[PDB]
Design a protein around this ligand. Structure first.
Ligand code: HEM
Ligand SMILES: [Ar]
Ligand SMILES: [Ar]
Ligand SMILES: [Ar]
Ligand SMILES: [Ar]
Ligand SMILES: [Ar]
Ligand SMILES: [Ar]
Ligand SMILES: [Ar]
Ligand SMILES: [Ar]
Ligand SMILES: [Ar]
Ligand SMILES: [Ar]
Ligand SMILES: [Ar]
Ligand SMILES: [Ar]
Ligand SMILES: [Cl-]
Length: 148
């Protein structure tokens, strides 16, 4: 398709520095939905503030994990059924830790935000539409993990 190369092309520069870029996504995510912060409980303890999360190795390791799942979705953009299985399980786990399926709309806007900010003029409405569709495919697959 042409959408696939829009995604592949947009992801290139972001994918080279995954923690720097994922740190934008999370900072935006906590700015939109502060109530996500307490859901990371490493040694059953809660982050008081967003800048607290950024000092946590485990938290930063979760940013890399997110970005690796996105790298998988970009990799397999033309055949996503393969990931469907993993993604339902991923969804299950995120129900187990306290994530409300509604919070993933905030995730999508954070991912668009981060991409818009690294691409500037290159993130065209077509690029936005391409990502919104891929992210949608991801979220359908993970939401099976709440039930469906
Ligand atoms: C509101 C958004 C999210 C919250 C609060 C959240 C929270 C968590 C928590 C608490 C864990 C277990 C602790 C840890 O491994 O670091 C986890 C694991 C994970 N998260 Fe997230 N998460 C969210 C979104 C995402 C998204 C969007 C992705 C991927 C696209 C993702 C990928 C993962 C992965 C890969 C793991 C490892 C699970 C496993 O295989 O054990 N997370 N997340
Ligand atoms: Ar991320
Ligand atoms: Ar953050
Ligand atoms: Ar991962
Ligand atoms: Ar993955
Ligand atoms: Ar994703
Ligand atoms: Ar999880
Ligand atoms: Ar996320
Ligand atoms: Ar994401
Ligand atoms: Ar998205
Ligand atoms: Ar995605
Ligand atoms: Ar997917
Ligand atoms: Ar997602
Ligand atoms: Cl490259």
């Amino acid at each position: 398709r042409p959408e696939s190369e829009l995604i592949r092309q947009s992801w290139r520069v972001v994918s080279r520095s995954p923690l720097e870029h994922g740190t934008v996504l999370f900072a935006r995510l906590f700015a939109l939905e502060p109530s996500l912060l307490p859901l990371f409980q490493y040694n059953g303890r809660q982050f008081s503030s967003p800048e607290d999360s950024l000092s946590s190795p485990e938290f930063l390791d979760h940013i890399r994990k997110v970005m690796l799942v996105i790298d998988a979705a970009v990799t397999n953009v033309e055949d996503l059924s393969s990931l469907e299985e993993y993604l339902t399980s991923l969804g299950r786990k995120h129900r187990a830790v306290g994530v409300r399926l509604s919070s993933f709309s905030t995730v999508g806007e954070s991912l668009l935000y981060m991409l818009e900010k690294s691409l500037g003029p290159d993130f065209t409405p077509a690029t936005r539409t391409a990502w919104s569709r891929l992210y949608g495919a991801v979220v359908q697959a993970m939401s099976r993990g709440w039930d469906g």
